[PDB]
C-alpha cells in the first residue's frame with residue numbers, strides 16, 4: 001500500500017546526510033518525511049551490537065557493556081560493544097572484532113539477528129545484534145587487552161545478568177550516565193521473563 | 195574529562211537538524227563529529243516514549259502488543275513497540291498511555307517508566323522513556339479495541355505471546371519483507387536468554 005516515490009538531498013556531511021522523502025500514504029495521498037541516513041553503508045546493515053555474556057565458573061554470569069563519551073549526546077553513555085561493519089566484513093567477524101577492540105575479550109558467536117532498525121521514525125540505520133559468550137576462565141580472557149581505534153576511548157562495565165536492570169538504574173542514579181535503549185530493553189525483558 | 199566545545203548548525207529542517215559538534219577528547223585534543231538532533235524537543239525529559247504493553251487475560255499467555263507501520267526513513271514496514279513524541283507539557287507516562295490508545299486502541303495501566311535512554315548515541319541526541327504498561331484484556335474497555343490513528347498515521351496491531359516472542363518475530367520476518375526494531379529484538383532475545 002505505501003512506498004517511496006523520491007528522495008531529495010537536503011545536506012550531506014562526510015558520515016551523515018539529511019533527505020526529504022516523498023511517499024504514498026495508503027489513502028493515495030503524497031506526503032513528505034525528513035529522513036537521516038549514514039553515507040557509509042556499501043553491507044547487511046550499518047553496524048553490529050554485541051550482547052557479550054561473560055561466563056566464569058563460581059561467578060554470576062555478566063553482560064559486558066561499554067561507557068564512552070558520545071558527542072551527539074553531549075555526555076557519557078552505557079551501551080553494548082558496537083561498531084560499523086567494514087566493507088566486505090561479515091556481521092559475525094565485525095562482532096568479534098568490535099568486542100575485542102572495545103573490551104579486549106575474545107568470544108564465540110552464539111547467534112546473530114537479521115538487520116534490525118535503530119530509530120526507523122528518523123533514520124534508515126540498522127544493526128545486527130550478535131549474542132557472543134566469553135569463556136572468562138580461558139587464559140586469553142585472563143587480562144583482557146582493549147585495542148581502541150584512533151579517537152575511541154572506552155571504559156568496560158561488566159554487570160551481573162541476574163540483576164542487570166537494578167544495576168543500570170543505580171549507575172544512572174549515581175553517575176549521571178545515559179543507558180542505551182537496546183541495553184535497557186534487554187535488562188527489562190530479563191526482569192519480565194519472570 | 196570529555197565535553198562539548200561548540201555545536202555549529204549545518205542544516206535545519208522542520209523536524210531534524212545536522213550539527214558539527216566540536217568536543218574535547220580525553221588526551222586534551224579538539225575533535226569534531228556529525229550529530230543529528232530533533233527540532234521538536236522543548237522542556238521534555240526525552241523526545242519520545244516507547245511502550246512495552248503486556249496484554250494480560252485470564253486463561254491466556256501474556257502477549258506483547260506490537261505495531262507495524264510504513265517508516266519513510268527505512269523505505270519499508272517496521273515492527274515496533276507503540277511509540278510517539280512527547281507533547282509539550284505532557285508527562286512520559288501520559289504520552290505512553292495516549293500513544294498506546296491511539297496506536298492500538300488498548301487502555302493500559304502504568305507499571306514502570308525508565309529514565310531517558312538514547313536511541314542511537316553514536317549518531318543522534320534522540321532519547322525516549324521506555325514505559326512498561328499492563329493491559330487488562332478482561333476489561334470491556336479492551337474487548338474490541340479501535341486504533342485512533344492521527345493524520346497520516348496507519349498502524350496495524352500485532353500481539354505475540356511473550357513466551358514465544360523471538361520465534362514469532364523470526365516467523366513474521368521469514369514470511370514478508372519487514373524490519374524488526376532493535377529494541378523489540380533486544381527484548382525478545384532477553385526473554386529467550388532468561
Ligand SMILES: FC(F)c1nnc2c(C(F)(F)F)cccn12
Pocket residue numbers: 032033034035121122209210346
Ligand atoms: F523528523 C522526521 F521524523 C519527520 N518528518 N516529518 C515528520 C512528521 C510530519 F508530520 F511532518 F510528517 C512528524 C514527526 C516527525 N517527522
Ligand SMILES: FC(F)c1nnc2c(C(F)(F)F)cccn12
Pocket residue numbers: 015016151226227228229316317
Ligand atoms: F556520522 C557521525 F556519526 C560521525 N561523525 N564523525 C564520525 C567519525 C569520525 F571518525 F570522524 F570521528 C566516525 C564515525 C561516525 N562519525
Ligand SMILES: [Cl-]
Pocket residue numbers: 053110131387
Ligand atoms: Cl546466552
Ligand SMILES: [Mg+2]
Pocket residue numbers: 081082083098102
Ligand atoms: Mg563502538
Ligand SMILES: [Mg+2]
Pocket residue numbers: 082083098101102149152
Ligand atoms: Mg571499535
Ligand SMILES: [Mg+2]
Pocket residue numbers: 276277278279293297
Ligand atoms: Mg508512533
Ligand SMILES: [Mg+2]
Pocket residue numbers: 277278293296297344347
Ligand atoms: Mg502516534
